[PDB]
């Protein structure tokens, strides 16, 4: 299956990878422009599950792997940067696991190495909403993903808000086969073991605020990556390249700078 | 098992409500917050409050318990609920101990019958909604009216999120042990739980407030999401004699969450009252 993909610039190769439910789009307001500034080539795409795939269902995370590759292969971009946000972190952790060729570098945001308890709720509760077939309302929805993503600091400040609101109907998040799948696109086991024979250098990103996935769990892939460093982000949610996107184009772009393509 | 008679609602019906009344000591009033029984105070409050030496009323806010099918009342007749037990007992002015609803409550109940109250803890609190909080307010409203009923798995991980700290929810055994307690603490959805969510703040009552002559002692907690503790922190600063106390690794929930860290700053500020 081609996947859809934008692909900006020229220059050194940064394959970006949306977490669960995200398009390519999702790295173009506030990513990809930073990053053609500093003189990357962006390649954006739409994972398996979204978009003209939403009715995939059956694959797993090494379909996803396998799909990451085959666009990295197609390009002729090996090896790339790659920059990742949770499902999109696990990705392209896991892809580092099995190709490690195709990747000279890597930020992971929000990301996690294992089945850790927060994770289980997580799956369990996503599960149970798509199974019950149950429709929330649209206020409702628009609440839980306010409390879910965001900083405390952003829940205060009454113009930011609304905006998010606003954002959130230019944003839908249709419930397809496809985002179902995408839940079961997570860690299973504990991976950390695995991540000890990754040799490129990673920077992980913990949001401060995330309770989707608490910081604590990109401090454990750093901890298990040879070439890892750890880096938090204060005041900001699961959502956080969106949310402080200076302070995370900064880190990455000091990051990337650092190293070799 | 005791009762008083509630104050007449706006469909002049009057109703009663139970009450518990222990020890002998200085009186303190506690008042609920939405959908808290007031065996809510009873694991934690009360028995600190009862070793100091004060008598503990706690009781069963209109839309709760026995009375839990109410609907059509508003802020106005919770506060003369409140009043009533208060006169009802002969025990004006009482000291009072309100959390988030429960606060709202005994604001009120000082900006129109101060000679009631002598002095207040105010825990979790606001004097208006801000953007956010006047849109969970509408979420919540809307989830009910639209007679969708939460899966049961969501439901309890919502209420953790919503409800605990960041150190509570990093902390798998705690979260083990909250969850449980969930079980045994059921809310049930009920016309009078809906008909508590707005009894809330409509417009600003900040400046209301700043004629309230009682010392107050209103309390934050810092990782509380449904009433930020900034939003108390304007509390504090409207009452002339009102203060601002910030509990560390405390959701909504920090006086069950943090029982210790609460009970002594209250008792702390009870002593010199007045
Ligand atoms: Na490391
Ligand atoms: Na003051």
Not at 27 to 47: E, K, M, S
Not at 70 to 96: C, H, K, N, W, Y
Request: hydrophobic share 45%.
């Amino acid at each position: 299956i081609n996947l859809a993909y934008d692909d900006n610039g020229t220059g050194d190769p940064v394959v970006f990878i949306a977490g669960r439910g995200g398009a390519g789009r999702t790295w173009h307001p506030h990513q990809v422009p930073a990053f053609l500034a500093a003189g990357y080539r962006c390649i954006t795409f739409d994972n398996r599950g979204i978009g003209a795939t939403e009715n995939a269902e059956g694959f797993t995370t090494q379909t996803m792997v396998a799909d990451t590759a085959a666009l990295i292969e197609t390009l002729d971009i090996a090896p790339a940067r790659v920059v990742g946000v949770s499902m999109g972190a696990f990705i392209a952790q896991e892809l580092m696991v099995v190709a490690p060729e195709l990747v000279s570098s890597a930020v992971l945001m929000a990301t996690r190495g294992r089945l850790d308890r927060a994770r289980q709720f997580f799956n369990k509760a996503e599960a149970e909403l798509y199974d019950s077939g149950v429709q929330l309302p649209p206020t409702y929805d628009a609440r839980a993903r306010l409390l879910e993503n965001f900083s405390r600091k952003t829940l205060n400040d009454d113009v930011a808000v609304g905006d998010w609101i606003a954002m959130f109907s230019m944003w839908p998040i249709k419930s397809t086969p496809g985002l179902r799948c995408q839940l079961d696109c997570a860690p299973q086991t504990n991976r950390l073991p695995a991540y000890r024979n990754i040799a490129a250098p990673v920077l992980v990103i913990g949001f401060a605020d995330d309770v989707v996935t608490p910081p604590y769990l990109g401090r454990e892939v750093a901890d298990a990556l040879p070439n890892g460093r750890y880096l938090q982000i204060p005041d900001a949610g699961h959502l956080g390249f969106f949310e402080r996107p200076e302070a995370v184009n900064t880190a990455m772009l000091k990051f990337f700078a650092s190293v070799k393509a």
